[PDB]
Design a protein around this ligand. Structure first.
Ligand SMILES: [Zn+2]
Length: 257
């Protein structure tokens, strides 16, 4: 198998007699295939930064042991230049305490695995506009700081209504230094959708949110070159190409009427 860095894969395995799926010493969680009752699924993601060159997964069965080899592909990501406020790439010392606390809070949330589906069928795109900055662009801020784009940006004037891409539970709903006003939704199975730089937040932590429900208004809060919506997906423990992930998820979990 081959996988571009920064993307997720849905691995399909036999359900009968399955015992565990591991990557080195790390157990990878599994969930039921919604269509095929003889199969289970697992999400495997490669990070954009510092992925391994190769991966060997091992699936253990009562009477089988299967090694699965995945080659990391570099992809064809391009570069872009952005101008932002200097304090958003070199934050004052008075602010680094908040940045560290916000980082620790987010790490805690993403390690809190929900072993059931909170979603309802396929994901929607949270905005009906167009991509202005695609996932994985290699970025330079102010000709000084290298970065990479960990989500996808959509055109949005300040005040554009933003709707939940799928049903789930709100885990973050507050102003953060870099992301600005942020909403993060747990959809189950380690899948989180992220909505950043908002001007207004319309949900609160712990809220059960349904697909298509208003979660806030787009803005220009946080580290920005101008107003837009940043949409992200964390899955398999990594930030992944969100629209690529949604296409792969929907191919499995979409429903009819
Ligand atoms: Zn972005």
């Amino acid at each position: 198998m081959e996988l571009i860095k920064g993307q997720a894969l849905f691995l399909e395995l036999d359900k009968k007699d399955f015992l565990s799926l591991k990557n080195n010493d790390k157990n990878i969680p599994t969930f039921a295939h919604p269509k095929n009752q003889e199969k289970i699924l697992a999400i495997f993601s490669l990070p954009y930064k510092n992925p391994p060159q190769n991966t060997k997964l091992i699936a253990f069965y009562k009477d089988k042991k299967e090694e699965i080899f995945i080659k990391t592909l570099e992809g064809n990501y391009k570069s872009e230049k952005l101008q932002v406020e200097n304090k958003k790439i070199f934050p004052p010392k008075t602010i680094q305490e908040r940045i560290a606390k916000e980082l620790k809070e987010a790490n805690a949330i993403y390690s809190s695995y929900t072993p059931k589906a909170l979603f309802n069928g396929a994901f929607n795109i949270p905005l009906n506009s167009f991509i202005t900055s695609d996932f994985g662009k290699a970025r330079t801020f102010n000709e000084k700081v290298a970065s990479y784009h960990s989500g996808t940006d959509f055109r949005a004037a300040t005040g554009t209504p933003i709707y939940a891409a799928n049903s789930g539970v709100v885990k973050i709903a507050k102003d953060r230094y870099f992301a600005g006003n942020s909403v993060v939704i747990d959809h189950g199975f380690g899948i989180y959708s992220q909505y950043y730089h908002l001007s207004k937040i319309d949900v609160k932590v712990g809220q059960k949110i349904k697909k298509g429900e208003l979660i806030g208004l787009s803005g220009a809060s946080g580290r920005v070159s101008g107003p837009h919506l940043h949409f992200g997906i964390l899955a398999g423990g990594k930030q992944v190409d969100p629209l690529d992930f949604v296409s792969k998820f929907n191919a499995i979990f979409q429903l009819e009427h």
